[PDB]
Structure 1
Amino acid sequence: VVGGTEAQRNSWPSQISLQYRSGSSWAHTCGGTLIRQNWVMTAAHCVDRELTFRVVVGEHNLNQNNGTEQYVGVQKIVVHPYWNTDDVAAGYDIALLRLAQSVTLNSYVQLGVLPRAGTILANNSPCYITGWGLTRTNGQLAQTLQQAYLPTVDYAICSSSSYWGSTVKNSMVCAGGDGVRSGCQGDSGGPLHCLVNGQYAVHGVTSFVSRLGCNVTRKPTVFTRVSAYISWINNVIASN
């Protein structure tokens, strides 16, 4: 997250860190949202590499443990069947991870709230992106979980020629694009949390930013629209 602030440790308890095995260690690569005690929602593109993945729930500072972490292996990966790695503009950038064990819920570890199927946000709706992604274009991952206020940019604006043009689809949510705050590499897969009727719900799965940089005016961060995939999510979980 470029241009954000450190979150409170209990603000975003559905946020997970998706990590891969790197030698004798583990490295954060992506975010995700805990959606059952044994299922995480992330971006398809985060799992294109055939790596060994784990999920960390309750995490806050990737560089300093505080005793609220739980670590669990990824047991099964179900990528959206229409995802194509070489065509992120086509959409379908979503995947579900079944965890090896169910995590324990507490004030740091909670299920994310998903929207009802088909819900679209009015333009300029209030949302926050969260994650450990780069804090500057070509920078480094955050140590502490970051948040940034990123109001939505509706489809009509986001798909206009000076924004994302035909790269954005109605199965996506755009947010931000001021040139100051944005997602960045390493935020992918994580949530866009939007305040509706007094409650935050996870309306987005971080999918892409511009090739030119993370915080780029008229290139809002682009998320998979969770509410386009409710039936898919429920069908995968019921089948597995």
Structure 2
Amino acid sequence: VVGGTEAQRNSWPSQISLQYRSGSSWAHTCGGTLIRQNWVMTAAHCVDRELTFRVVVGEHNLNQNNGTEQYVGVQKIVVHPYWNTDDVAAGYDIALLRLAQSVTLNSYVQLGVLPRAGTILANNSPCYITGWGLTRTNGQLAQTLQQAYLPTVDYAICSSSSYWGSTVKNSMVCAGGDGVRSGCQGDSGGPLHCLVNGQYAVHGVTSFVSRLGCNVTRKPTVFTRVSAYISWINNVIASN
């Protein structure tokens, strides 16, 4: 997250670290949201390479013991049928991961709340992006969970010529674009948490930033809009 503050150890308990095995080590690649005791939601592009993946829950500092972490293997990946690797701009950037164990829920490990289907956030709705991703463009991953305040930019404005124009679809949410604060490389698959009726719900899955840089004036971070995919998520969980 560029222009972020460090998150409190227990403020975002559905945030997971998606990691893959590199050599003998494991390495963070993406975020995700625990949505069931045995199911994670992440971006489809995060599971495009055929790697061994694990999900870590109760995670705060990647490279120090925290006393909270449960480490569970991935048993099944269900990416969206319509996802296409060569066209992130088409949308559909969402995947569900079935875990090989239900995890123990506790104050560090909780299920993320999903919105209703059809829900559109109004322009400038308050939302937080969370993750361990890069802190500068071409920078370095954060050791500790970071968060940034990222108000929504509605469709009309985000699909306007000077912002993203045609790249953003109605199945996406745009947030940020002030030139200072953004998602960045590493944060993908993770949540955008927005306040609705006094409750935080995960409204976005981090999909992309600009190739010019993570924090660009007039180019907001773009997220898969979870509300468009509610039936799909439930249909997958009822059959796997």
Class of the TM-score when normalised by the shorter of the 2 chains: over 0.9
In the TM superposition, what is the alpha-carbon distance from 1:192 to its structure 2 partner? 0.1
Between the aligned partners of 1:101 and 1:217, the Cα distance in structure 2 is 43
Question: Equivalent residue for 1:139?
Answer: 139
Between the aligned partners of 2:119 and 2:26, the Cα distance in structure 1 is 36
In the TM superposition, what is the alpha-carbon distance from 1:65 to its structure 2 partner? 1.1
Matched residue of 2:233: which SS?
Answer: helix
Between the aligned partners of 1:229 and 1:185, the Cα distance in structure 2 is 24
Between the aligned partners of 1:56 and 1:128, the Cα distance in structure 2 is 21
Question: Equivalent residue for 1:182?
Answer: 182
- Mapping for residues 37-186 of structure 1, pairs under 5 Å: 37-186=37-186
Structure 1 residues 174-212: Cα deviation after superposition (integer angstroms, max 9, x where no partner): 000100110001000000000011110000000000001
In the TM superposition, what is the alpha-carbon distance from 1:66 to its structure 2 partner? 1.1
* Structure 1 alignment gaps of length 5 or more: none
Matched residue of 1:156: which SS?
Answer: helix
Between the aligned partners of 1:153 and 1:173, the Cα distance in structure 2 is 8
Matched residue of 2:237: which SS?
Answer: helix
In the TM superposition, what is the alpha-carbon distance from 1:6 to its structure 2 partner? 0.3
Question: Equivalent residue for 1:202?
Answer: 202
Matched residue of 1:111: which SS?
Answer: coil
Matched residue of 2:113: which SS?
Answer: coil
Between the aligned partners of 1:118 and 1:53, the Cα distance in structure 2 is 32
Report the TM-score, using the length of structure 1 for normalisation.
Answer: 0.99
* Structure 2 alignment gaps of length 5 or more: none
Matched residue of 2:238: which SS?
Answer: helix
Between the aligned partners of 1:179 and 1:60, the Cα distance in structure 2 is 27
Between the aligned partners of 1:218 and 1:234, the Cα distance in structure 2 is 35
Matched residue of 1:18: which SS?
Answer: strand
Between the aligned partners of 2:27 and 2:218, the Cα distance in structure 1 is 31
In the TM superposition, what is the alpha-carbon distance from 1:26 to its structure 2 partner? 0.1
Between the aligned partners of 1:176 and 1:59, the Cα distance in structure 2 is 26
Between the aligned partners of 1:43 and 1:66, the Cα distance in structure 2 is 26
In the TM superposition, what is the alpha-carbon distance from 1:63 to its structure 2 partner? 1.3
Report the TM-score, using the length of structure 2 for normalisation.
Answer: 0.99
Between the aligned partners of 1:95 and 1:161, the Cα distance in structure 2 is 30
Between the aligned partners of 2:196 and 2:25, the Cα distance in structure 1 is 39
Matched residue of 1:122: which SS?
Answer: coil
Aligned pair count reads: 240
Matched residue of 1:17: which SS?
Answer: strand
Matched residue of 1:10: which SS?
Answer: coil
Between the aligned partners of 2:197 and 2:62, the Cα distance in structure 1 is 32
Structure 1 residues 101-145: Cα deviation after superposition (integer angstroms, max 9, x where no partner): 001111110000000001000000000000000000001100000
**What RMSD over aligned residues (CA atoms) do the two structures have, in Å?**
0.4
What is the identity percentage for the equivalent residue pairs of Structure 1 and Structure 2? 100
Q: Which of structure 1's runs of 4+ aligned residues deviate more than 6 A?
A: none
In the TM superposition, what is the alpha-carbon distance from 1:98 to its structure 2 partner? 0.2
